Design a protein around this ligand. Structure first.
Ligand SMILES: CO[C@H]1[C@H]([C@@]2(C)O[C@@H]2CC=C(C)C)[C@](C)(O)CC[C@H]1OC(=O)NC(=O)CCl
Ligand SMILES: [Co+2]
Ligand SMILES: [Co+2]
Ligand SMILES: [Co+2]
Ligand SMILES: [K+]
Length: 304
């Protein structure tokens, strides 16, 4: 394999971290290839669930706990810390909140969160590499509680970063919030991508095409599919009770992606940096509820 950038995997990984049996597990957790029968059973549907009152409560809870866990990870970002060490802390924090770390054994994914450094777009596997001054790193948290998944991510600075890093991360956050600000009953899912690309392009950045936002509730991913690029053909229209993510991945260079031999790590083909932010949203009558919102600050971590 020809690596696209300076990043390499740092193996071996520590043995798989156990989750105590008292934590309720998603169906894929104990499947040998980490396949989900309930996802298999709904695979291919276009229908978007309208959440019940119970469902909304369950999504509010799991999304609040996911935020708490991302906040644990944020507090550990500094030169010298390995992404594996961040994952360890994340794993323990999930368990301390009586949640299952949704990524663990999802289609045999080996870790409890995704850590995406520099040219990694998404799905980076926590490993023995210490974070370096100048790096950007995304931490993506997904938790499972009482039958519901919640999903969010932020990009962080590792010490002092260059002006390009500041601009990429700022612009990416702005893309997310402009998309969020458009969410309300009667808006087409395909419209969010127009908004995102418009801002990205204005700032000299490109938009990843192979990865999209998604429905989430009883399944980790389901309808709707939410591309972040302009003039997409996503299907469907927002209604009150829809829950989905918006999670734009923006790149310094070209939009094209490729996967490492690990089968998960998505990288820019050109080796330039990519940044991402993600919230889980519930569509309401006024607009939306940001279920994964930070509660003790108006701002994401990179702004402090
Ligand atoms: C809908 O899929 C999702 C993908 C997904 C759920 O497949 C992932 C399994 C998750 C883990 C944490 C290992 C991710 C990681 O959320 C990125 C966005 C989207 O990526 C694509 O759209 N593709
Ligand atoms: Co997501
Ligand atoms: Co995510
Ligand atoms: Co899947
Ligand atoms: K990245």
């Amino acid at each position: 394999y020809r690596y696209t950038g300076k990043l390499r995997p740092h193996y071996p990984l520590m043995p798989t971290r156990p989750v105590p049996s008292y934590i309720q597990r998603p169906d894929y957790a104990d499947h040998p290839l980490g396949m989900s029968e309930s996802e298999q059973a709904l695979k291919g549907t276009s229908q978007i669930k309208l959440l019940s009152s119970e469902d909304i409560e369950g999504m509010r809870l799991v999304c609040r706990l996911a935020r708490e866990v991302l906040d644990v990870a944020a507090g550990m970002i500094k030169p010298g810390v390995t992404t594996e060490e961040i994952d360890h802390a994340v794993h323990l924090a999930c368990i301390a909140r009586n949640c299952y770390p949704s990524p663990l054994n999802y289609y045999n994914f080996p870790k409890s969160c995704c850590t995406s450094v520099n040219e990694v777009i998404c799905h980076g596997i926590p490993d023995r590499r210490p974070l370096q001054e100048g790096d950007i790193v995304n931490v993506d948290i997904t938790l499972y509680r009482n039958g519901y998944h919640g999903d969010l991510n932020e990009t962080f600075f590792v010490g002092e970063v260059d002006d390009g890093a500041r601009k990429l991360v700022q612009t990416t956050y702005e893309c997310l919030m402009q998309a969020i600000d458009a969410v309300k009953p009667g808006v087409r899912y395909r419209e969010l991508g127009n908004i995102i690309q418009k801002h990205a392009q204005a700032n000299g950045f490109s938009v990843v095409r192979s990865y999209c936002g998604h429905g989430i509730h009883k399944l980790m991913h389901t309808a709707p599919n939410v591309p972040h690029y302009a003039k997409n053909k996503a299907v469907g229209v927002m209604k009150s009770g829809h829950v989905f993510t918006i999670e734009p991945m923006i790149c310094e260079g070209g939009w094209q992606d490729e996967t490492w031999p690990d089968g998960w790590t998505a990288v820019t083909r050109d080796g330039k940096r990519s940044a991402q932010f993600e919230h889980t949203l519930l569509v309401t009558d006024t607009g939306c509820e940001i279920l994964t919102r930070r509660l003790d600050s108006a701002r994401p971590h990179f702004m402090s």
